[PDB]
A paper describes a structure:
First, we addressed whether the serine residues that occupy edge-on positions are required to confer preference of the PBE. We substituted alanine for one (AS/Y or SA/Y) or both (AA/Y) of the edge-on serine residues. Intriguingly, all of the mutants with edge-on alanine substitutions and a tyrosine stacking residue retained preferential binding to the 8-nt PBE over the 9-nt FBE. A crystal structure of the AS/Y variant in complex with PBE RNA was nearly identical to the SS/Y structure. FBF-2 R5 SS/Y bound equally well to either an A or G at position 4, similar to WT FBF-2, and the R5 AS/Y variant accommodated A4, G4 or U4. The tyrosine base-stacking interaction is critical for binding energy, whereas serine or alanine residues in the edge-interacting positions permit binding to different nucleotides at position 4.
PUF proteins, named for PUM (Pumilio) and FBF (fem-3 binding factor), are an exemplary system for understanding the divergence of RNA recognition within eukaryotic RNA-binding protein families. Eight PUM repeats are arranged in a crescent shape with the RNA bound on the concave face of the protein. Each repeat contributes a trio of amino acid residues, termed a tripartite recognition motif (TRM), that directly contact the opposing RNA base. FBF recognizes a 9-nt motif, 5´-UGURNNAUA-3´, whereas PUF-8 binds an 8-nt sequence, 5´-UGUANAUA-3´.
Residue numbers in the entry: 168 to 569
The structure:
RNA sequence: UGUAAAUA
């Protein structure tokens, strides 16, 4: 910190004015000091004369090197964000040259700033506050090569991609959907902790739900196309993603969203059907199997039920069947509980049994009677287990209501 | 009895 601005105790002075700092040429020393930048952040929020704004503009966002030094700084990045907001609120003659220059600074250093803990906040701020036409040019500065994978899986930069998805029209970031849909890229990005949030946010934005009713028809076509490109890649690697520690959330998200119903159905048939017993015994995919049971259309649900009750040859020596395996399995037991809960919800009115022009009530009662007979016959072994006690209780609570 | 995001 500069000595001219200190007391005889070594502390910063009170009664210090913004203009003294701006006139001193020492702003950069204040902006990276906690006490200095705290002073600047309060001063910058008050009434500013035209010349004060002018100095802040040239000293904070006017030269590329100091702008980057401040943007990547623990304290400075906050001052940068405030001065950008003031710049956007000041419609003087130099407005346009200020905003284009800000676009050029960030554009030339887009990748490095995205991956920085502090500069990625300057990017996120600019994307949602700048004029949309300039914000779109920032998006265009994103890399199209291996760096984009790194950006998606970065603990900081993944939030830049999600911000783009939230506040920029799809036409400007459609290249990201096609980048991510390329099979090798999709594999790397969905099987990563941060990348899986990225893919899920994209899918949500490409979904024709109540949050997108404001799109034009043309924009809905654009959206539907990008959605179908991505769902085609997701459904081709569907087994791999369903069993992965992070990507299983993407499959669950698709399967449980009614506004993705046609993709729910492709996933169930392409990936889960004929593999229900195997996937019910997987740590991560057993969650996907639960979502499938909870949200399948009723004629697929019938096939899923029939696969569990009758799809597998019993063990040649013991006669154990799929239901026997699943009820006592560390993950499969949660899928049987889900099947039981669906059936008790149906017969008690908690779940609508009318679907495609028919009341499937008779089918839920069939499946329930199967579970009830099994749980009755095996009640002694089942009562040794928490899951088993819960099914016995679930059936006892049903006959109490009905 | 079973799994997921970063600034004073």
């Amino acid at each position: 910190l500069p000595t001219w601005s200190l007391d005889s105790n070594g502390e910063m002075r009170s009664r210090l004015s913004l203009s003294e700092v701006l006139d001193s040429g020492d702003l950069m020393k204040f902006a990276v000091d906690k006490t200095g930048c705290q002073f600047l952040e309060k001063a910058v929020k008050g009434s500013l004369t035209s010349y004060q704004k002018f100095q802040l503009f040239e000293q904070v966002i006017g030269r590329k090197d100091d702008f980057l030094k401040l943007s990547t700084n623990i304290f400075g990045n906050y001052l940068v964000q405030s001065v950008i907001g003031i710049s956007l609120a000041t419609n003087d003659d130099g407005y346009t040259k200020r905003q284009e220059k800000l676009k050029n600074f960030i554009s030339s250093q887009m990748t490095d700033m995205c991956l920085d803990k502090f500069a990625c906040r300057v990017i996120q701020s600019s994307l949602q506050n700048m004029d949309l036409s300039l914000a779109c040019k920032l998006v265009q500065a994103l890399p199209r090569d291996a760096r984009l994978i790194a950006i998606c899986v970065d603990q900081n930069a993944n939030h830049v991609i999600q911000k783009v998805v939230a506040v920029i029209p799809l036409k400007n970031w459609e290249f990201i959907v096609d980048f991510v849909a390329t099979p090798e890229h999709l594999r790397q990005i969905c099987s990563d902790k941060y990348g899986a949030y990225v893919v899920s946010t994209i899918i949500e934005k490409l979904t024709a739900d109540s949050m997108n009713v404001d799109l034009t028809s043309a924009a809905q076509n654009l959206r539907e196309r990008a959605l179908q490109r991505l769902m085609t890649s997701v459904t081709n690697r569907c087994q791999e993603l369903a069993t992965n520690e992070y990507a299983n959330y993407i499959i669950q998200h698709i399967v449980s969203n009614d506004d993705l119903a046609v993709y729910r159905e492709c996933i169930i048939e392409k990936c889960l059907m004929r593999n229900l017993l195997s996937l019910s015994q997987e740590k991560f995919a057993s969650h996907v199997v639960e979502k499938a049971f909870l949200h399948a259309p009723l004629e697929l649900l019938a096939e899923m039920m029939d696969e569990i009750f009758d799809g597998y040859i019993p063990h040649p020596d013991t006669g154990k069947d799929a239901l026997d395996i699943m009820m006592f399995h560390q993950f499969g037991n949660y899928v049987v509980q889900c099947m039981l809960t669906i059936c008790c919800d149906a017969v008690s009115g908690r779940r609508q049994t009318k679907e495609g022009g028919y009341d499937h009530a008779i089918s839920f009662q069939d499946w329930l009677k199967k579970l009830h007979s099994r749980v009755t016959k095996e009640r002694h072994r089942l009562s040794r287990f928490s899951s088993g006690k819960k099914m016995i209780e679930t059936l006892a609570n049903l006959r109490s209501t009905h």
